[PDB]
Amino acid sequence: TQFNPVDHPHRRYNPLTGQWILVSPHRAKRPWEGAVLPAHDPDCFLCAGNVRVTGDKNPDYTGTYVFTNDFAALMSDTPDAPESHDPLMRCQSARGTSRVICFSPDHSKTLPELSVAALTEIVKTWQEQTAELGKTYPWVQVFENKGAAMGCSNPHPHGQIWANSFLPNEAEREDRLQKEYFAEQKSPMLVDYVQRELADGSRTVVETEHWLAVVPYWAAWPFETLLLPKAHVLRITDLTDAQRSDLALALKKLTSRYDNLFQCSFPYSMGWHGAPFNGEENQHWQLHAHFYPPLLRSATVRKFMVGYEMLAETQRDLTAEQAAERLRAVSDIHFRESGV
Amino acid sequence: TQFNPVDHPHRRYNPLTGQWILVSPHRLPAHDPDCFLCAGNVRVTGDKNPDYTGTYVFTNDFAALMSDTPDAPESHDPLMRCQSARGTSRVICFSPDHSKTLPELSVAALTEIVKTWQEQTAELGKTYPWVQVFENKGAAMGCSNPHPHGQIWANSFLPNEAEREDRLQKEYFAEQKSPMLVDYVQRELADGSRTVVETEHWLAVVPYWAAWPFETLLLPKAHVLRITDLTDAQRSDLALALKKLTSRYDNLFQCSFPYSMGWHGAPFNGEENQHWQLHAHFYPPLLRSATVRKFMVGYEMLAETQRDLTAEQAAERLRAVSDIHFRES
Ligand SMILES: O=c1ccn([C@@H]2O[C@H](COP(=O)(O)OP(=O)(O)O)[C@@H](O)[C@H]2O)c(=O)[nH]1
Ligand SMILES: O=c1ccn([C@@H]2O[C@H](COP(=O)(O)O)[C@@H](O)[C@H]2O)c(=O)[nH]1
Ligand SMILES: [Fe+3]
Ligand SMILES: [Fe+3]
Ligand SMILES: [Zn+2]
Ligand SMILES: [Zn+2]
């Protein structure tokens, strides 16, 4: 009859990557089948005062602590790979460094369980590290991989920061696409997007005075979110103190809604994408963070991005709109902090 | 201090996707009474499987695409735009043996699987431009039912991977006047460093730009556009190459090796597709052992794929084991 994206399969475009996502909204459904940590761990290599696998001892830190990855995948003095135009087998040089960021000394407190003051210190540390690395490397990538579903055997809450001498794949593509949009539209892509989402609200999950978190229109993972500042901001280092303290609040609310969804510590991979330190005019950029969680149906039922998804294109069953509604239905106060 | 790809991190380019990969080299019964895919059993839907022999193909009971979905409104919005999507999905049971995976089947049985892939591709290609034959194997890929099977999806459009591969192959052919993967197959044949399986008409290698630890690319030595174009000799040899490749993967850690695999051939879009070269990709998640796997998360989802073992080391490791399944030895 008449197309209704709530009922009919369709593909949605991702303007940041130039790819499409296949949405299948009313898939036939299968038959109903039916329905604590210590604050300090003596063996934890990330805990304060402990010795790392390498022998280096961690200080008796009280807030965040950043150290160079003992097993860094990149190094700052790597020799250059030879120049090649080989259409089939070619390589390029790679230099960088990697650092681990302990969010706090408490071995059992994840982001939504930390206070706004503690979260503000984390943002302060992300800014300091990004400013320092940006002086030498054009691309700085702050990220966090959380949970065993993501491959983490050590639950100590922490993130990582990688610096690259080149623009990795996602960055170069987001940079190009954003540039094109800006050249034609004269406004940054994501700033216009924030405006549209604020007028709509159907995909909104968290809204604070300076931040907006939505399940993007083009979301690929079930409960994936995109966190963006409401004003035009190029890098994390450019946030005003007010935007910074507010970011800590948005993060706390966003991560608490994720943990309340299934009443469990929700795994995900998250990272910040900001203008590169390449000396160019980067007005086309908009600082933003992506959150990519694997869980789909329960604290134990996850989405496996395989087969058809790896050979052709990502496919999803729950729409971005339904996912946002589910995230808005729970509380924004972490279950462990609320007396419920 | 000379640049040494064996010691120094570096990036390698993937000509099929136009993306770089970062390398840091310094870093069960035959019949199950409850199985929905078993011969003579009933499915969720109450439909009953025939006592099939060989392969068995049926329309997926929970298909994500339908053939008659109404079209979506045309739109050129640069931010929020959708497009129509039609198609179908079918499940392909490899054999009635609930416990025999690809490496454990006879070359004759595998040849029947290839013939089915060809029949299903020809049939669906009359209506759809893209036909995707694939296989998701193992609990690590989310497979609850170990009954060996694959799936076949048809789309009214070219999915992301197909679109990109078609365009990059087309560009290369315009400039070189030769198909990208035909050239690549000839170069690897002459090298050997990344070769894992070589038969009369096929070659399987750990591609130079491999992203997953023991990922392989299986290609015909001659220029072939689609699976439906293989001669009978090529088809029978394909069965043997598949038995050898999959046998090597299972012998690596001596366990049923999980992977997701799929064929990419020229689309049925009525154009000149001489630029294409039929190929299959094998993307296995295991890395160090039968339990220790590779997670493509964090840095990789936010920037680019990273690998610790080089393509040359992974190929050397696959070449070191026997190509006869450990249970047939
Ligand atoms: O009655 C049925 C049962 C299953 N399937 C499909 O067949 C495959 C396997 O189903 P099963 O429960 O055996 O394993 P699972 O899909 O859950 O790993 C999947 O493609 C299902 O979508 C189907 O089409 N009809
Ligand atoms: O003594 C140690 C232990 C771990 N790590 C690093 O911290 C992260 C911890 O995560 P994982 O490997 O425990 O999963 C990794 O990137 C790892 O290399 C160190 O740098 N030093
Ligand atoms: Fe981004
Ligand atoms: Fe391909
Ligand atoms: Zn700890
Ligand atoms: Zn079975």
UniProtKB/Swiss-Prot annotation, chain A:
Cofactor binding mode, per the note?
A: Binds 1 zinc ion per subunit. Zinc binding seems to play a structural role.
Indicate which residues the UniProt annotation says bind Zn(2+). Answer: 44, 47, 107, 156
Which residue positions does the secretion signal occupy?
none
GO molecular function per UniProt: ferrous iron binding; galactokinase activity; UDP-glucose:hexose-1-phosphate uridylyltransferase activity; zinc ion binding
Please cite one Gene Ontology biological process associated with this protein. Answer: galactose catabolic process via UDP-galactose, Leloir pathway
Outcome of residue 156 to N?
Answer: Decreases enzyme activity 10000-fold
Q: What is the effect of changing residue 47 to S?
A: Decreases enzyme activity 600-fold
Q: Tell me which InterPro entries the record gives.
A: GalP_UDPtransf1, GalP_UDPtransf1_His-AS, GalP_Utransf_C, GalP_Utransf_N, HIT-like_sf
Essential cofactor(s): Zn(2+)
Pfam families with a match to the protein in the record: GalP_UDP_tr_C, GalP_UDP_transf
Read off the SUPFAM superfamilies from this record.
HIT-like
The record's similarity note reads: Belongs to the galactose-1-phosphate uridylyltransferase type 1 family.
Q: What is this protein called?
A: Galactose-1-phosphate uridylyltransferase
What is the protein's species of origin? Escherichia coli (strain K12)
